[PDB]
């Protein structure tokens, strides 16, 4: 103003994972079309922000990072995310280094994980060739092995962008209502 309560952002930040790995064109373009849609569908109610720092590292020797992303920079980015959610705008992270929900499981971010799922590995393969194949297939396969109810908040398995967008919007409109009762008053 053992602990029973963990402090989390006032609006759970939306993080997209799948169909495959970020940094490659199939995943990057498929997620971008979704971010583009959110930007206009939730205009005035959403903040979409790039996170390049490796927020997977968020949680008597001093703890340090062995990559270019420091624990101080990560902490700065965690505080920026909490602060962006403080007035209850929807928050969406374009988080470069998160390709799997287990990478945020131990943070205090409590994300809404949106799984952009290609149901068939054969469809994913052909997609990639239509444009480093094996790292992409393994990442998609890892996603497909997660227990869906506990790992993901939304699964977009629709093959039409229009239908994936409306399903995600429906979810985010309901979250909006849950967080804004009338009684309270790639990118």
């Amino acid at each position: 103003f053992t602990p029973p309560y963990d402090v989390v952002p006032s609006m759970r930040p939306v993080v997209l994972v799948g169909p495959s790995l970020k940094g490659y064109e199939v995943t990057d373009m498929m997620q971008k079309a979704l971010f583009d849609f959110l930007k206009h569908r939730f205009e005035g109610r959403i903040s979409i922000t790039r996170v390049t720092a490796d927020i997977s590292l968020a949680k008597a020797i001093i703890e340090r990072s062995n990559t270019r992303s420091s624990l101080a920079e990560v902490q700065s980015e965690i505080e920026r995310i909490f602060e962006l959610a403080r007035t209850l705008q929807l928050v969406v992270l374009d988080a470069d280094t998160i390709n799997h929900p287990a990478q945020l499981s131990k943070t205090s971010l409590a994300p809404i994980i949106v799984y952009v799922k290609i149901s068939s590995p054969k469809v994913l393969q052909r997609l990639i060739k239509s444009r480093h194949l094996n790292v992409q297939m393994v990442a998609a396969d890892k996603l497909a092995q997660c227990p869906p109810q506990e790992s993901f908040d939304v699964i977009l398995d629709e093959n039409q962008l229009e239908d994936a967008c409306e399903h995600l919007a429906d979810y985010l409109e309901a979250y909006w209502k849950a967080t804004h009762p009338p009684s309270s008053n790639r990118t």
Binding site: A33, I118, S120, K122, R126, L127, N159, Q160, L161, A164
Partner: peptide, 16 residues
Amino acid sequence: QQLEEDLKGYLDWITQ
């Protein structure tokens, strides 16, 4: 054929 409609869907998504 379901896989073929899948692929066309995702190709159109990527194009968008």
